[PDB]
């Protein structure tokens, strides 16, 4: 996404677009993801939990448009789909909402770095930006409530990190938000991630290094007053990421 700007994949080169092939052969967009190493994309478990058959998924890198080709784009199959075993969902909140996709081209190759395909750095253990930090989100999600199709062009926006203390206020999310989550929103509630942006990156500049701080996970509505976007706090899951890769 709501608000923000249209972007191109060269400005977001770690961005992974994940689709699912349906019975009958139609393909639909599922979620975003982030390239963290040449063979590994990180995303959200909630994006796959209802259809956990890895053969059905297609992952694109270097892609700026939803339904047309981008020069330099690479297409991948999923070799291994790793969902978090302690994933659960409440009415609003999603817990341990993190997934790993090992990707492989039909030739058995991983991603080849380029102008439009790059990895994003992971954060260090229990190291996050201070609240109030401006961070970027990217995706093909809804631009407004009334959208019935996702936008054709990739989008990005900038939101500010919100403290756990603020996010757990009773008119925010109360105790439904936990310390393994990060909240972020626009101070004027004019821009946010929305449906279809799940799984995609929340990127902050840490020590001059662009870092994957969060994964789009949940939220009530989109750009709704006092209802931030909620993101999986990547820095908490480093042991899980390290043990599964």
């Amino acid at each position: 996404i709501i608000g923000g700007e249209f972007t191109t994949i060269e400005n977001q080169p770690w961005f992974a677009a994940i689709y699912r092939r349906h019975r009958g052969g139609s393909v639909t967009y599922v979620c975003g993801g982030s390239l963290i190493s040449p063979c590994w994309v990180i995303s959200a478990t909630h994006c796959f939990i209802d259809y956990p058959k890895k053969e059905d998924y297609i992952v694109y890198l270097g892609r700026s448009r939803l339904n047309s080709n981008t020069q330099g784009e690479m297409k991948f199959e999923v070799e291994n789909l790793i969902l978090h075993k302690d994933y659960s969902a409440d009415t609003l909140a999603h817990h341990n909402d993190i997934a790993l996709l090992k990707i492989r081209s039909k030739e058995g190759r991983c991603a080849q770095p380029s102008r439009t395909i790059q990895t994003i750095a992971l954060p260090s253990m229990y190291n996050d930006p201070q609240f109030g930090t401006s961070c970027e989100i990217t995706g093909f999600g809804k631009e407004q409530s009334t959208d019935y199709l996702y936008p054709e062009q990739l989008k990005m926006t900038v939101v500010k990190l919100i403290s756990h203390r603020e996010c757990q206020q009773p008119h925010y999310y109360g105790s439904e938000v936990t310390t393994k989550m990060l909240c972020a929103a626009d101070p004027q509630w004019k821009t946010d991630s929305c449906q279809g942006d799940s799984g995609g990156p929340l990127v902050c500049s840490l020590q001059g290094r662009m870092t994957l701080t969060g994964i789009v996970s949940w939220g009530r509505g989109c750009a709704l007053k006092d209802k931030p976007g909620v993101y999986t706090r990547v820095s908490h899951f480093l042991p899980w990421i390290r043990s599964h890769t």
């Binding site: 979620c31 796959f48 209802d50 259809y51 449906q195 279809g196």
Partner: peptide
């Protein structure tokens, strides 16, 4: 019911 971020690619969506 099950709408928005968290509910992509769900039967309940």
């Amino acid at each position: 019911g099950x709408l928005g971020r968290g509910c992509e690619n769900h039967r309940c969506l």
